[PDB]
């Protein structure tokens, strides 16, 4: 398809970031990564990839606002102030630092607060998920559709737990959700990168996905992918503030609805 | 080059099987999967990959015994009767049928019941894990080591829940196991192919792994990979009958010991 210029800029920026990340991982597989130096090696790769993305974006749009995982939020100016790029230069950091080849670059563009363009790029598998509002979604140029599955029977769901200490008090809640889904589904997967879980919803590889504790840069692009593939995205209450609240349900039509209903009785008032 | 001829035969057979499976997934992502036809399409692809592997093996060793996931157990003759090939032609069947690009061919060779050769091949990522007894393990020719991590602090563990009706009754123990691991670890992953989880333990990508409900062809090759990379493998009671019993713990030295210890209080009454 003929992509809008902004989507093409984001895609080329993701490609450069992903190639940098790929070279980085290749050296880190052949060397011992001390665990005291591991978090600093990760900070390095994040910031170098973020620099790559932001440099490419600002070469084309110097007046746009940028919100990066590493750099925070920097406002735009003039008309460009209505554009906000939401960047995770490396989604899946625990996988990356352990050498697990499942992670992605995630770039979204919001126009006046609504999702307008999205890229999720797997640089290992060379899988480029792209979308623009009203243009559909694609994997390496091919149109994407959510799966047709009519219920949770035999469904393949994605999920992921937030592993940091301040979510420990939610474990039973999560484990309750999980508990109630094991009977109906064919499987539940925790692969460790929410942007690729959403991308997989968009491509029909997962029938639905849910998670809490996420940040905006992990979910923004993938949510647009799911929407443009004909799916649904909400927070745990069925409203559209998933980006701000950190909990998200995405899926095809019927499996989104069923998954939302299923998880309702286990929601803490914290996540309501 | 450095490989013994028997290991090279197994590796070439795995490559051919993997190319067949890869072409298959490519046709099934762009076409509708009825789901009435899903079990028949997977059976078709399994049997074609198994035929590919078995034809390659028997062209070199016609008197060896063969045990395929699709096919039965067929004994050998003469000295060759002491050799048994243990084949899962396509590990990760739920992933495969949904288009999730994470699955592998698994081929092990046992000599008088002891693991002698092993191949786990990821045809999407083109990752060839090979090992021979007393020869070490390799990823695409590069020698492999288990990670050096000394405890579960910050560890990345793999596991799989078993989804069948006949394991539903073990779920609570599992969710208990999971609970006791959430505080210390950086993550737990359920990617959906036990052979690649074991391969990732061998390569240092996971620090440890546990799962029950597996079949021999799921575990055999990956178990040799972990052993030859310097790790430890046992069943849930610490003995070496994981292949017959279907439950397995694998890991680097200290994380293997800690994970086995952690899961002892959660064993269902069968296991003491």
Rg (CA), chain A: 18
Among B82, B109, B143, the domain boundary falls at B143
Partner-chain residue, chosen from A163, A171, A179, that has the shortest CB–CB distance to B187: A163
Q: Which two tokens stand for residue B60?
A: 């070199």
Q: Which two tokens stand for residue A80?
A: 């460009």
Distance separating alpha carbons of residues A204 and A149, to the nearest angstrom: 9
Does A125 reside within a domain?
A: yes
Torsion sign over Cα A127, A130, A136, A142 = negative
CB of A168 within 8 A of CB of B182?
A: yes
Q: Do B161 and A182 touch (CB under 8 A)?
A: yes
Among A91, A114, A143, the domain boundary falls at A143
Asked whether residue B124 falls in the same domain as residue B168, the answer is no
- In degrees, to the nearest 5, what angle opens at C-alpha B69 toward C-alphas B192 and B216? 70
Asked whether residue A22 falls in the same domain as residue A121, the answer is yes
Asked whether residue A79 falls in the same domain as residue A163, the answer is no
Task: Determine contact: A34 vs chain B, CB below 8 A.
Answer: no
By C-alpha distance, the chain A residue nearest B39 is A154
CB of A130 within 8 A of CB of A7?
A: yes
CB of B250 within 8 A of CB of B146?
A: no
Distance separating alpha carbons of residues B64 and B84, to the nearest angstrom: 6
Asked whether residue B53 falls in the same domain as residue B83, the answer is yes
Distance separating alpha carbons of residues B224 and B226, to the nearest angstrom: 5
Domain residues for the domain of B106 are 5-143
Q: Which two tokens stand for residue A21?
A: 């990340």
Task: Determine contact: B178 vs chain A, CB below 8 A.
Answer: yes
Q: Which two tokens stand for residue A215?
A: 């940040």
Asked whether residue B181 falls in the same domain as residue B137, the answer is no
Does A149 reside within a domain?
A: no
Interface subset of B 53-92, CB within 8 angstroms of A: none
Tally the domains of chain A. 2
Question: Tokens 């920026």 map to which residue?
Answer: A13
Name residue A211's beta-bridge partners. A248
How far does A168 lie from chain B, in Å, by closest CA? 7
Asked whether residue A135 falls in the same domain as residue A161, the answer is no
Contacting residues of B for A127, CB less than 8 Å apart:
101
Asked whether residue A133 falls in the same domain as residue A164, the answer is no
Distance separating alpha carbons of residues B48 and A124, to the nearest angstrom: 28
How are beta strands A127-132 and A136-139 bridged, if at all?
Answer: antiparallel
Asked whether residue A188 falls in the same domain as residue A127, the answer is no
Q: In what order do the strands lie in the sheet with B208-211?
A: B187-189, B156-159, B208-211, B248-251, B232-234
Best mutation target, B34, B125, B189, B202, to test chain A (most A CBs within 10 A): B189
Q: Could you give the C-alpha distances from A28 to A22, A31, A50, A100, B252, in angstroms and in order?
A: 10, 5, 19, 11, 18
What residues contact residue B23 under an 8 Å CB cut-off, 6+ apart?
Answer: none
Does A270 reside within a domain?
A: no
Does A83 reside within a domain?
A: yes
Does A135 reside within a domain?
A: yes
Query: Across chain A, which distance is largest between two alpha carbons, in Å?
Result: 54
Residue A118 exposure: Cα atoms within 13 Å on the Cβ side: 34
Does B66 reside within a domain?
A: yes
Q: Alpha helix locations (H) across B132-252?
A: 171-182, 194-203, 216-228, 242-245
Asked whether residue A132 falls in the same domain as residue A162, the answer is no
* CATH number of the domain enclosing A192: 3.40.190.80
Write down how long chain A is: 272
* CATH number of the domain enclosing B19: 3.30.540.10
Resolution in A: 2.6
Closest CA to A5 of A56, A55, A60, A50: A60
Return the residues preceding each gap in chain A, C–N over 2.5 A, or none. none
Does B148 reside within a domain?
A: no
By C-alpha distance, the chain A residue nearest B196 is A100
Among A95, A114, A143, the domain boundary falls at A143
Q: Do A188 and B190 touch (CB under 8 A)?
A: yes
Name residue B223's beta-bridge partners. none
How are beta strands A208-211 and A156-159 bridged, if at all?
Answer: parallel
Q: Which two tokens stand for residue A15?
A: 């490609």
Method: X-ray
Name residue B143's beta-bridge partners. B138
Query: Across chain B, which distance is largest between two alpha carbons, in Å?
Result: 54
| 3-state SS record for chain A | CCCCHHHHHHHHHHHHHHHHHHHHHHHHHCCCCCHHHHHHHHHHHHHHHHHHHHHHHHHHCCCCEEEECCCEEECCCHHHHHEEEEEEEEECHHHHHHCCCCCEEEEEEEECCEEEEEEEEECCCCEEEEEECCCEEEECCEECCCCCCCCCCCCEEEECCCCCHHHHHHHHHHHHHHHHHHCCCCEEEECCCHHHHHHHHHHCCCCEEEECCCCHHHHHHHHHHHHHCCCEEECCCCCCCHHHHCCEEEECHHHHHHHHHHHHHHCCHHHC
Asked whether residue A118 falls in the same domain as residue A170, the answer is no
Distance separating alpha carbons of residues B191 and B160, to the nearest angstrom: 7
Phi, psi dihedrals of residue A231, rounded to the nearest 5°: -95, -170
Q: Could you give the C-alpha distances from A5 to A51, A57, A72, A87, B255, in angstroms and in order?
A: 21, 11, 25, 18, 50
Burial class (CB in 10 A: 0-12, 13-18, 19+), A197: buried
Task: Determine contact: B187 vs chain A, CB below 8 A.
Answer: yes
Q: Which two tokens stand for residue A20?
A: 């940098």
Interface subset of B 228-267, CB within 8 angstroms of A: none
Asked whether residue A114 falls in the same domain as residue A178, the answer is no
Q: Do B29 and A178 touch (CB under 8 A)?
A: no
- Mapped onto helix, strand or coil, the DSSP state of residue B244 is helix
By C-alpha distance, the chain B residue nearest A207 is B98
Interface subset of B 200-219, CB within 8 angstroms of A: 200, 203-207
Asked whether residue A128 falls in the same domain as residue A161, the answer is no
By C-alpha distance, the chain B residue nearest A171 is B179
Contacting residues of B for A124, CB less than 8 Å apart:
125
Does B250 reside within a domain?
A: yes
Q: Which two tokens stand for residue A121?
A: 């790029």
């Amino acid at each position: 398809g003929s992509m809008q210029p902004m989507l093409n800029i984001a895609l080329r920026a993701a490609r450069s970031a992903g190639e940098l990340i790929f070279r980085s991982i290749e050296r880190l597989d052949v060397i011992s990564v001390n665990e005291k130096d591991a978090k600093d090696y990760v900070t390095e790769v994040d910031r170098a990839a973020e620099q790559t993305i932001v440099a490419a974006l600002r070469k084309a749009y110097p007046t746009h606002a940028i919100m990066g995982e590493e750099g925070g939020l920097i406002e735009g100016s003039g008309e460009g102030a209505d554009y906000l790029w939401v960047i995770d230069p490396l989604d899946g950091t625990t996988n990356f630092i352990h050498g697990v080849p499942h992670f992605a670059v995630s770039i979204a563009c919001k126009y006046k607060g609504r999702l307008e363009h999205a890229v999720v790029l797997d640089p290992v598998r060379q899988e480029e998920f792209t979308a623009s509002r009203g243009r559909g979604a694609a994997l390496n140029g091919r149109r994407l559709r959510v799966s047709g599955r009519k219920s949770l029977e035999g469904a393949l769901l994605g999920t992921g737990f937030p592993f940091r200490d301040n979510q420990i008090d939610n474990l039973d809640n999560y484990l309750n959700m999980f508990r109630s889904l094991v009977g109906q589904t064919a499987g539940i997967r925790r692969a460790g990168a929410a942007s690729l879980d959403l991308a997989y919803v968009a491509a029909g590889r997962y029938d639905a996905f849910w998670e809490f504790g996420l940040s905006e840069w992990d979910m923004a692009a993938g949510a647009l992918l799911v929407q443009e593939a004909g799916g649904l995205v909400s927070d745990f209450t069925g409203s559209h503030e998933f980006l701000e609240k950190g909990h998200i349900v995405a899926g095809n039509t019927k499996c989104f609805k069923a998954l939302l209903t299923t998880i309702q009785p286990h929601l803490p008032p914290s996540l309501k």
